[PDB]
Design a protein around this ligand. Structure first.
Ligand SMILES: CN[C@@H](C)Cc1ccccc1
Length: 233
């Protein structure tokens, strides 16, 4: 019902300005937010900011002065402008749509890679995921954990699954609710600063990366992730 597609240069010189476009297609919308999220090499996800249905914007303090998110409703597009880029801005950029009236769904674009040839100040909740890599035999009960540096509302603790060459997919919302498309063998639990995702019985198709995410406090943050691999070569 809602598809997003990012576009723009794949290479930019330092000090130059980065400009990306997100073309939105699908059914009409009566609310919601369009966010820009980037993933650095190593797979760390970074929440950049958003522009709402009413043009209200929020920018991650670490980008505040360099970023601008705008909209051109007549042509159903959202834009991202990041000034004075450096090698630290090399990453895959994704635009995403979310309707706070419906926590169970989130849509992500295909993402577009950008390689480069802190006025703000604030605070953020750090999400730790250990171990970073994990191997399990099919049939094993698997448990992945996520520890927040500060408390977060369980209603705002989400989990995403990502496989190489694909954008993150909403997996669990509000700590223990499975998203559409997720096998019931998955479950989640937790509260305060301690959360977990469990697979009753590891299946081959479950090998992928899993990231926890919190949008209880601004700026929203993502965990470093846990790469789950299967055993037996
Ligand atoms: C669940 N993922 C959040 C980034 C969706 C969102 C976007 C904008 C405002 C609030 C919430």
């Amino acid at each position: 019902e809602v598809q997003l597609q990012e576009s723009g240069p794949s290479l930019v010189k330092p000090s130059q300005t980065l400009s990306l476009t997100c073309s939105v297609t699908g059914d009409s919308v009566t609310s919601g937010y369009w966010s820009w999220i980037r993933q650095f090499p190593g797979n760390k996800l970074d929440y950049m900011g958003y522009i709402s249905y009413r043009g209200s914007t929020y920018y991650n303090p670490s980008l505040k002065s360099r970023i601008s998110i705008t909209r051109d409703t007549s042509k159903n597009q959202v834009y991202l402008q990041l000034k004075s880029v450096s090698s630290e801005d090399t990453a895959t950029y994704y635009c995403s749509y979310f309707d706070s009236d419906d926590y169970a769904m989130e849509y992500w674009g295909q993402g577009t890679s950008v390689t480069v040839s802190s006025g703000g100040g604030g605070s953020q909740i750090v999400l730790t995921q250990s171990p970073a890599i994990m191997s399990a035999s099919p049939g094993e009960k698997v448990t992945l954990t996520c520890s927040a540096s500060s408390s977060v509302s369980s209603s705002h603790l989400y989990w995403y699954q990502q496989k190489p060459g694909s954008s993150p997919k909403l997996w669990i919302y509000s700590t223990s609710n499975l998203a559409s498309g997720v096998p019931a063998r998955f479950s989640g639990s937790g509260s305060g600063t301690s959360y977990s995702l469990t697979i009753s019985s590891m299946e081959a198709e479950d090998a992928a990366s899993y990231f926890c995410h919190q949008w209880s406090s601004f700026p929203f943050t993502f965990g470093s992730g846990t790469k789950l691999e299967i055993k037996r070569a």
